[PDB]
Write an enzyme that holds these catalytic residues in place. Structure first.
Site, PDB file in Angstrom:
ATOM      1  N   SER A  51       1.837   1.392   1.249  1.00 39.02           N
ATOM      2  CA  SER A  51       0.440   1.341   1.683  1.00 39.02           C
ATOM      3  C   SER A  51       0.362   0.950   3.167  1.00 39.02           C
ATOM      4  CB  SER A  51      -0.345   0.348   0.815  1.00 39.02           C
ATOM      5  OG  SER A  51      -1.719   0.333   1.171  1.00 39.02           O
ATOM      6  N   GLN A  52      -0.148  -0.243   3.469  1.00 34.02           N
ATOM      7  CA  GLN A  52      -0.212  -0.675   4.857  1.00 34.02           C
ATOM      8  C   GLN A  52       1.205  -0.630   5.435  1.00 34.02           C
ATOM      9  OE1 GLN A  52      -2.143  -4.493   7.229  1.00 34.02           O
ATOM     10  NE2 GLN A  52      -0.363  -4.838   5.895  1.00 34.02           N
TER      11      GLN A  52
END
Ligand SMILES: [Cl-]
Ligand SMILES: [Cl-]
Ligand SMILES: [Cl-]
Ligand SMILES: [Cl-]
Ligand SMILES: [Cl-]
Ligand SMILES: [Cl-]
Ligand SMILES: [Cl-]
Ligand SMILES: [Cl-]
Ligand SMILES: [Cl-]
Ligand SMILES: [Cl-]
Ligand SMILES: [Cl-]
Ligand SMILES: [Cl-]
Lengths: 318, 320, 318, 318, 320, 317
Positions: free
Chosen positions: F180-181
């Site tokens: 994700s991030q």
């Protein structure tokens, strides 16, 4: 609460066929006549409120079925005539008559009356309950246009304008009707049944395009209709119910509005779905404008409040 | 769900002080008199239903305020007299008059009438709406005992018994009143206002110990009262509201019940909290019994259905 | 509430390609033969119940894998022969054998047996657990048609008919199979594997169109399959699983039903999606009828109960 | 989240009366004897995995009821003997045998076997289903200690230790049992029924103080028992069920644990309520320690992972 | 949606031990001195708004850390001096600077400034982020009282009063501070750190009795602290965090308030639990009053708005 | 359950780039400002109950003179060692993710888990220009120079420069990973620096912003929607998306030249499938996207095997 209805491009073109019955116009003509047979006999009583520059009163008057309708009336404490506003509140959303908002409107320079909807925020409802219906007001007396809950309410709204207009301190040529959701619908319906109001402002109006509403709404109170059908499975009941609803549907009344109108809609509104509001708007034939707010739902929209004040100021305050 | 109310040991001892006003009995005496002034003028119309051995009818009659009350009436298709039952349905919980359940009761041997509560499952309500109230029936006309919603309903229940008992195929000495939640309350209230019914069966009765109910309930419809107070903040309104409610509270009516009574309660009921039901039960002075079901809430309790059938059978079907 | 599956117009036309493998028929032939090898050896024991005019018994019999199947049997207390019904209960939805409903059916005039599904509402399941699977019965022994949970259940349903049919008080020519969801599926499957039943009534049948079901269902228990794949990521396992399921899918069994059939479906059903039910219905080649209820989901539908009683009365009672 | 169980002060003092029946000890003696009668006959098969310094295998062995139990076995790729660990997984919480975690434990220097619990993450379960029960494994065969689901599981755990201990690359004097929730319970039960393990590490152990658990738990799977009683209302069934459960309750087995033990508990755990875990802990009479984590629930607790690694290293690796 | 905290009887006597460190007073003295070293240098820019009788402006000024704080300032369009109000908004609850509410207050006769809280509704925050913290502002720079997020905010609030008081159209002797939740806390803290305001009105004040708050709150944002501890398990971190918070906790600042105070609390408030608000109130030693509303939570309370308007009118509008 | 575009449409989804004319100039100038800050790294041994791995607390100076931190684990044996820079998820770092860092080291990689400014650790000297919605997504969003992720992206690049300079590290065998991030930071780093040899990104975040705000059903993309609700000026929305375009993966993916491995669960409601396919379809390099029908925004067991195999093939050898 993310997008869910038709795309913006489709909403702009959404204009469902009217569902008005052949006797639509005659029904309202007769209803307005039954209303006229009731003497308004309004009463005013001063009401104390911690504010300077505004006088508040409790107003009552007789309406359809000899029901005593009530609401707070706030007036700028200075020499008139004053422009006026009739504010309608949301479904089961009236707390203490919404007196604080009424007073603030008066502070903005408008003689304001917040009509309380029968049995909700106040006001008496003499109309009988013909039979069983779902929890709420949406399906009360729904098996006949003559007994339907909103018949009296719509007439109360019209009578409210007739009473306000008769006040000496009020300039009958500068009266506006406003409200959100249920209030927006009452504003539009009143403007459609009466030529007294000069302008209309309706935030995401309710009671519009019922047949699509019951299939798209994801929250109360449109779903009260679905609840009703679950409890009364007779096919003829569903048919009759929608027949009744058509007499009060905004898509059939919008055509009668001749006043400049301002509307608002949030694209993630789950209570009054965008499609139902665009439907009402697209059936209006008058100086109109619909403000679309992508990131808002069925709630107070700050940016629209600015539009609203600007619009009312332009047409009424001067 | 899961335990949340008082412990079972405390529930058994919970008996709140009555809230009945000095004119409590006078009020019901006058109300029953206003009811008497209205001629029943009952009507029966055959109603087709796919069942063998039972005749179904649509029954109507005039009651308080000249309201036309309705409901389905099912009768065992055989020579009577038959024991009878007046069944009351739950709050906003009536679908198509609950005809299927009415028919089944008749198949069990009972001439059964399912009275439809004003404006809910059916029946007309001529009582006007004095003013604003919260969404629902709970607070309609709550600022006065004379205009309160349940005044008419309670009287309709009493009138239901007077009509049923007048039927030739019915044995006036073997009539029972039953119901769950709202229905249980109407059964108890009817038995308290009339000596026509012989027995009472109430599943987790509603409309009991209102002052505690609004502070303990976690789901509708008791909370409609809380909603009402939020919309009408005047302190005198809250006082007045509870005054009105006391005239219809089961903890004040229970004392008048003289018939054998059977009650049920699930300890995880969030709609009709255990404490409010025990409160009603502990105010009863009669042949009584309360079945406690640890793992159930506000719903159909299978084990209790057997207790119910056994109880009605012993007092009605197989008696006299 | 609210609609979510295909539109009604599309649902009426939805008829997915059968997924039956070439040995489909042979598998059931062999399975029915393994069943035949087990002597029923039924037993009846009177059971007290507070009701007049009906005698209740606890019935047991041997079935596939020598499993002892049980259930309550209620009989009208009067001289027969009586028309009969084999009622199947919902997934994990049997309380105290559903005795109250069984008794009521007998009061309606039907000798009724409520077969308890292996390990759920009752009955023994001797079938071993081959290996790991998701919480529930949906994926037990799913890696092979021979070990799958529903193989035994379907066979028990057939054996139930063979046992009831042999009773002297029962009229073998007037036997019906009924049930909702899991029960509806068992009713259909039994009618497909046996010609003993005369009619079929199935409320929103489960176990149908598996491949679409796992992608459209929004609630349990179809999703148990999805849970299974999450815990066993091997691609060949997913392929194998759907292969197994095809032998029990109603879209592949419906074609064998020759008895008059009545079905029901609520358009907002999130457990047994409308499309999966229409799929089963559209694969039926017999005197059939599907009742569609717009405002209901996976629940008791009052209006349909009337249809059901009328249908059973027409074909069995009268 | 938020606190909901007894206060910490009360938890430290909570020690419910044992519920063990007079034949408690005899039951396990007999069970262990029936296990002994089944030849382990273990098998190892190399299993490819993208890691350097560790060899992975698929291990299987015969256990109670002649059930084939399986799981992954990872060994440090170097000259032994190696300290070992038998890891038990959580209820219905095994994905692909938890292979990634097993390999990581091996990388930490432990020959590790992740036993798959019957019918859940893997392994065969030959025990028959006596009758109806609620969705899940918690109430399978609950009307008798001989048929109860966890009887086989507990024995499989013991057999796992006997198999691992026999391996030449394993140092039988340095074997530990670990796991969370269901896994923690199996670790404790195994250490209670066998003296093979040297140490025990259990994260918020499950299957403890059943009678309180069904009244305090707010989430699955303890509530499966409540569901079972709802479906089988006979009072004798509830009594019988708790009788059976007592033979597997950690508060009755804890007393047999002689190995150093490390436990953890989050004060907002709604699956394995704090009181049930303190109950098990307070019944332990051995070198023990309970780590209390105010802000965590039924989940991976980072701070405890450090405690765990330190503890295992101190008693096994170093 | 229902009662959950201590009973009303217990709330009235709930007064937790202060958690102020021995250097509490010195910390604020030092902080106020650092603020004094920054020249206000305020600026006003007319802002168009569709209203008659009120002039609106965008106001900015320099504060702690040389941060430029902003907000809308509405003034009655008539000859002054005018009584004034500094309104503080709720946590992450500022939409378009709350301009509509600011204008309405001016229409009521008050020169009103709605200070925007650093990084939330507006205003610049020059304070650096020392290290990791949980999502939100509650734990930013929490490992030290010198770096904590609310140090700058509290000082901005004080500076807001110094700026407003210097305006010629404002009557320095009739200035009030108001706000709800986070705003209520800022109003109380400002009145505690400055003697400029004459009165205080705080709706269910936030940032009070932190140690109890993290164990009783059921909703954000108090729980941001719990989130922080989950991400930083070092026991010394929790100890240090609460040490920092004590310097900003209302139960330690309330004692400095000498102005008449009006507070409100809803008994079903899940965000600012009743106990935490009663704690702040019970630590006040001044002309005070706490309005208790049984049926309301963390929301606009109609009945209290009337109390508020009457209170401000009595002490500001109709006085001097 | 499924909710985004069909798999067939996802494979073809490739939104038009939103990069402004000065896109590359902006990053060139930003990297120059970073170069202006001396790394001045520091290492401090950190005790951890594990055999065969040495753990350290690493810090270094980055953009805006911010002190970035994180745990650094090294195989306890003679190097050079292949290395990994692991990036954590949005507000999802607990105790620096030390246990995962150590495990990576046990797999044979010198691993550094950079802590994202103000989240799991590390200092953020960048000022807050004005109001924004709760969270980091909209901090300083009215300008590319002040936006939150400007510093973060540069920290990621600097992390590579510091790790590469270590003697025990083989500069030619460095990989960037994250979910994700973290996946976005891995991709962004590989786009701004040629130091990393390979990239592995689990359902990358910060991609196709304009569609993300209309399709995401959960945080944190919705923080942008929250921001617009609080600042209704139309020019603000326009400006905000202008800023975001400088950090959007669909505009940075084109610069990635290293072999890349990505994963996506079809029921992911946080990083919607369409936004991830968008990033992937904008990649022009040796790539592969693993699609998992039954998973969402979570740990995907099957992909972990793909990941380990991929890193082993390109780095471990
Ligand atoms: Cl009607
Ligand atoms: Cl909405
Ligand atoms: Cl009233
Ligand atoms: Cl309940
Ligand atoms: Cl299998
Ligand atoms: Cl459903
Ligand atoms: Cl059993
Ligand atoms: Cl939990
Ligand atoms: Cl800090
Ligand atoms: Cl609240
Ligand atoms: Cl900004
Ligand atoms: Cl997700």
């Amino acid at each position: 609460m993310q997008l869910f209805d038709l795309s913006l491009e489709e909403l702009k073109k959404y204009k469902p066929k009217k569902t008005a019955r052949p006797d639509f116009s005659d029904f309202w003509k007769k209803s307005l006549e039954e209303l006229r047979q009731v003497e308004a006999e309004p009463t005013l009583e001063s009401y104390d409120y911690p504010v300077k520059g505004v006088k508040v009163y409790r107003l009552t008057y007789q309406s359809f079925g000899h029901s005593k309708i009530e609401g707070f009336y706030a007036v700028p404490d200075q020499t008139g005539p004053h422009p006026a506003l009739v504010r309608f509140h949301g479904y089961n959303a009236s707390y203490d008559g919404g007196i604080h908002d009424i007073v603030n409107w008066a502070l903005h320079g408008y003689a304001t009356f917040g009509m309380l909807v029968r049995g909700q925020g106040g006001s008496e409802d003499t109309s009988v309950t013909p039979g069983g219906h779902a929890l709420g007001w949406m399906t009360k007396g729904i098996l006949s246009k003559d007994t339907y809950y909103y018949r009296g309410v719509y007439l109360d709204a019209v009578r409210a304008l007739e009473v306000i207009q008769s006040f000496p301190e009020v300039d009958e040529h500068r009266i506006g009707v406003i409200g959100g959701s249920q209030g927006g619908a009452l504003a539009i319906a009143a403007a459609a049944l009466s030529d007294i109001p000069k302008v209309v402002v309706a935030d995401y109006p309710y009671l519009s395009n019922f047949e699509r509403a019951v299939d798209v709404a994801l929250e109360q109170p449109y779903l009260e209709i679905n609840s009703y059908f679950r409890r009364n499975s007779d096919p003829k009941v569903e048919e009759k119910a929608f027949e009744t609803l058509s007499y009060f549907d905004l898509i059939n009344l919008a055509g009668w509005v001749k006043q400049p109108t301002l509307m608002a809609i949030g694209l993630i509104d789950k209570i009054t779905p965008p499609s139902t509001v665009f439907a009402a708007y697209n059936h209006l034939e008058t100086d109109k404008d619909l403000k679309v707010y992508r990131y808002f739902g069925h709630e107070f929209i700050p940016a629209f409040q600015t539009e609203k004040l600007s619009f009312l100021q332009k047409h009424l305050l001067l």
